[PDB]
Symmetry: C5
């Protein structure tokens, strides 16, 4: 016999330089307050009278969700040659409540006749998430520049037909939860150096939604130079939109259905040359 | 000539540190007892009168399957510095009876007219499995908070419109076979550190189902720290739901159709620092 | 100025320890004899009167194909400590006649109206192959236990509603070509240690079929322990089912359409501890 | 400072042992001659009267394309113990004219009504290519053995119901351009040792076609023994069929639409023991 | 304790040998001028009277976009045995405005009835981009040689039924923005040695569009010999076409919808044996 190693499993505290945060963001489909009957859905989609006259009603436009996570304070002040910053290195994220769509008894349009189950959520889907050290930078682009957007959303200022394409003046920050419509704003690829975003769109009138879920998948956030998002002011920005599709009522009115998203982000303390004047 | 090695194939009894279990879980679509005529299917889906009035009939709601496999006993003493635990390291799993869907003679809605084959199982599908060292932890979220769930399923306590999104109070453990509805409960990603789960959903009214089967594929259960699920009290929890779609009757009533799932899990004995 | 190697291409005969076999399996959709007008298709699918009364006509049920290939004999003496066995290490396989589906002039239902081409083969597809050193082990599972299967197919003995799920009593060996219905039998994932199988299913009433073909792809048959199927009694079992979809007649009666599959298997001699 | 390497870009001519060939093959959908109005398409698909009476009209059947590329001559006398042969080692291939399908103004069946765009090419698609050192070897298999094929195509000799499955007597070589129907002939997997073929099929009546194009992709032609097709008689065989779908006319008659394929093949000289 | 390395994050200059450019190209669907109401869309697609009489209206034909980016001047003149050239080595590219398609209120054809949402953009899609050191080389091929193309597009000269297949005389350079119709011209695979192009097509009358967006993906532009496009005259050519599908009006007339594309290209200075006579 001899002395040798055996690997024992035990609870390990990570080093002090590493932290994990967890958060969930509830959808902002238009009914955005938990007490509302249609929480998690938009109001009925009202369609344009004409191109000239297209006025979506209040709460009919799905908007991005965003949360700002306050991270542990790293610096006494900002006066040294270097400072400490949290660097986001990886994320596990999941759309929660996918199985809620496996429901054919909810009141709606019938698949066949009134003896059958009801048509489930389907049609256009849009799933995106972002993790950044500052607000996600947005580019404005719309289907129609003559749409009149309601007061409670942030739309493009002085919208003109050029906004049906890319006008570099149409830019915003995703700095408010449930205020920036998905149909008006998309991530700005000419910026976002300090954010990672990922998105998937499938269109079509009645297309079946497709979603996966697992707790086994991690997305590494390091860029091509091996650096993750660096959290300015010790703030982590989590952004998403998860439009599952539309639910159709028996009367054939339709409402958008959104689902919440969970994030679990690992961050590490980094020494960084002081970027603050 | 010289002495050399030649590899002879033989039945190897694995080292005592390793074990394998096999199990199958029958679906729990609502007719959950093998003596029932519609075993493997739900009863006819009854749809809501109104949002205010939505009362699914008993046995119309597909539920998760769960089995608890008792593993060989490891510790006759639970008071030492360390104890032994089974660590689940990999799994092979397969949906069984996929070929049973390849059937156009079963009575139902006709594809074209009364001379044609009948519409096979189609529509929404949902396939998930979990392997864990304790019950799968669940998060409640429903399409409508005003549904009244029957007393033979576990649903969200004190359900309110907030349950149409994520309310962190709506939590449960998958600790009962065939009692937790799929449409109410999903895996809770904020917990489940000691479980691995995998799921795939495709919706739509009439979507063709798509399924693969092979005995060549293994999923490794080790997490990012190289550790698999650790089986508390020497119990392995296997969970799943395999909704293949709906079958439509000639009358156009529809029933969910589920399929069984087979698991083959490899585990190894680990020395673990005692939690007590 | 120097002696050096140059690679010359020549016909190389493999080492004695390696052999290759080629085979093809014709489809067994119901018309299973090449003299039959509808060879390679089933007869018209007849649908159930009711759940209680579901009697598929003879030759309306697609069945698995199987071929047993005799390999060179290895052991004249079966009494030593070890014996030799053929180990299947890789397979190249192809569904043949895919291009025969690229045909819109064949009589049937019209795509648009009587001036258009005819609806091609489409709907439910099922493609599987297995390579093993013994018959593929099957599990019985049906869509309906009240179906009465005809006497020219092997069905589940003493069928009960429990056979709509997984009943471990409902087991068989794929040991007859064109007799085991696809809709009754699937590979048994709890056995088949000595076989590798691979299957793909897409359902739906009218789904477009999708198929690839190439002679550039090989599948390795080695399991997790680096061991391929071992051919008991020097017999190699090839199994498959390749249902391309259904053809629809102008009358709207429907028939299954199957395609042949080709196999090319490489095997190597192994020394194996003598079981008997 | 020190002597060191710096990489300068310049035109490099490959070694004498390596050569590249380019070719394109136009589709043979039935209208196979460039001066014909429907060049690149079949004639209207005429459907069977009955299973017994199924006679496709002339030029309604898409056929494989094949080109023989004559490579530089390698051997003076074929009586040496070894000879030289060209070995095809890689290919870049592309379906050309994919963008021609992005056309909703072409006359035809309307998507919604007479104010809308016209239904584009869709339905059954079939894309294959082969690169080999001899003709592609074909297996016959048909949907129906009682079809009567036209005189201008090569069909299965003495067709029988057995030809609805695999009959090993039904074999042919793809040695004539626009003569071997796709619906009769497929690559024979039991042969073709000296060829590489690749195919993709999607069926269905009205299925959307899906196609990719890029100049960044190369397929290596070496087999599991590290050897590519060897060009017998210094001849390279290029084969394909690229059926994009069917076009539907206002009258609802339908025609197959094919697209051309480009090939770029790299070959190297090899010393080969004389057959 | 000992002297050891610690990795500090800072803004790094990047060598003088490397440069990055960014650009966006707006779609050229037919309404190509920002002031036009239907900017970003074609005019209504008018269909042929017959095969012999097929005359698409002005501005109904989507065309390729192209931009020429002027890079930093590298050489005093072209008189030396070797010159410096920019070599494009990688690109990040994104279709901008994908989220704008997540809009069911825009006027149009109804999904179910006048109470429901409107049918979103769907049907034929075509997405391609190219990065090159000279104009993309094009091959002409049409669905019908008897179509009459408008004066304001570059069509195949002396079109004949042979142009329904590949005729080697039907060749062009993509050297004008919004002039070369997608349905006439495709990348010429027999040339384009000095360009990298990538394309995806999905046809069908009503097919749901599918698009991804992320800022985490880079395409390497080096060929099989390890060489990227070399920029002749210090000009980088960016080409694309991004047809999202068609929008259908209530009247059932249809228009093509295109979306802008962003490019971020990384280039390096190379010594090149002088190719200019
Ligand atoms: Ca920038
Ligand atoms: Ca947690
Ligand atoms: Ca077993
Ligand atoms: Ca052979
Ligand atoms: Ca060339």
């Amino acid at each position: 016999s001899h002395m040798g190693g055996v690997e024992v499993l035990e609870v390990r505290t990570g080093p002090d330089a590493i932290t994990q945060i967890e958060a969930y963001l509830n959808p902002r489909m238009g009914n955005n307050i938990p007490s509302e009957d249609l929480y998690g859905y938009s109001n009925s989609i009202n369609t344009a009278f004409s191109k000239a006259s297209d006025t979506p009603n209040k709460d009919t436009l799905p908007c991005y969700s965003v949360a700002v996570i306050k991270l542990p304070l790293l610096n006494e002040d900002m006066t040294c040659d270097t400072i400490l910053m949290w660097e986001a290195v990886s994320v596990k994220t999941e759309v929660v409540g996918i199985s809620s769509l496996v429901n054919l008894h909810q009141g709606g349009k019938y698949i066949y006749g009134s003896s059958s189950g009801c048509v489930p959520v389907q049609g256009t889907t849009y799933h995106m998430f972002a993790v950044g050290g500052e607000p996600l930078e947005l580019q404005g682009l719309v289907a129609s520049s003559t749409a009149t957007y309601p007061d409670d959303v942030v739309a493009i200022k002085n919208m003109k037909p050029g906004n049906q394409g890319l006008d570099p003046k149409a830019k915003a920050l995703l700095d408010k939860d449930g205020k920036y419509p998905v149909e008006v704003w998309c991530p700005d690829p000419s910026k976002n150096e300090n954010t990672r975003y990922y998105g998937s769109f499938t269109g079509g009138a009645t297309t079946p939604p497709v979603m996966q879920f697992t707790n086994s998948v991690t997305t590494v956030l390091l860029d091509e130079n091996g650096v993750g998002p660096l959290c300015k002011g010790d703030k982590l920005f989590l952004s998403c939109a998860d439009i599952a599709g539309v639910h159709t009522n028996y009367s054939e009115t339709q409402v958008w259905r959104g689902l919440p998203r969970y994030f679990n982000v690992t961050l590490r303390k980094r020494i960084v040359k002081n970027p603050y004047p």
